[PDB]
Amino acid sequence: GSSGSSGMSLSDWHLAVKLADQPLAPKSILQLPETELGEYSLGGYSISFLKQLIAGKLQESVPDPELIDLIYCGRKLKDDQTLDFYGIQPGSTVHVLRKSWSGPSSG
């Protein structure tokens, strides 16, 4: 199998991502991968994970998943919480917030 393993699959669970820095920018759709568990309400995922997925899609603006954060329901989400803990559902929209500026002040 020289070719290898190529060709991701489409997931059911979907989520909306909005750039807090740009409230005018169009909302993006983030489709998280499947888990060893069934399909029923995830209720187990950890915010930390999301902070990565989103940061990976918004790489256009977001520098890194560690230099950013996730905001939901008007409140930040720690990496010690779960989707069920907050009550997040497949359809809501979260907002990304940058911890600080790169460094070289400009515009």
Side-chain angles (χ1 to χ4, degrees):
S2 187
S3 190
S5 191
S6 300
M8 65 186 154
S9 295
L10 275 297
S11 63
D12 188 50
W13 172 299
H14 81 256
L15 207 75
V17 175
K18 274 283 305 90
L19 200 63
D21 167 68
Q22 311 198 52
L24 300 150
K27 171 269 286 164
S28 272
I29 302 297
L30 186 87
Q31 293 72 286
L32 59 90
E34 188 167 77
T35 189
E36 31 271 333
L37 269 276
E39 68 88 57
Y40 74 133
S41 176
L42 306 183
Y45 272 72
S46 279
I47 302 306
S48 198
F49 192 55
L50 271 178
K51 288 175 167 159
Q52 316 209 337
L53 288 90
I54 288 88
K57 272 293 187 154
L58 313 189
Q59 279 273 34
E60 60 168 32
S61 271
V62 168
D64 269 85
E66 307 210 77
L67 316 174
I68 60 89
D69 282 299
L70 207 52
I71 317 299
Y72 177 88
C73 190
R75 75 165 64 84
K76 210 211 71 90
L77 315 169
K78 272 189 282 288
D79 46 285
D80 277 341
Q81 298 291 20
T82 41
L83 285 274
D84 159 65
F85 176 104
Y86 278 115
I88 298 161
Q89 271 150 66
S92 279
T93 321
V94 305
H95 290 279
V96 166
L97 206 300
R98 282 201 293 186
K99 295 177 172 196
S100 204
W101 158 243
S102 205
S105 307
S106 207

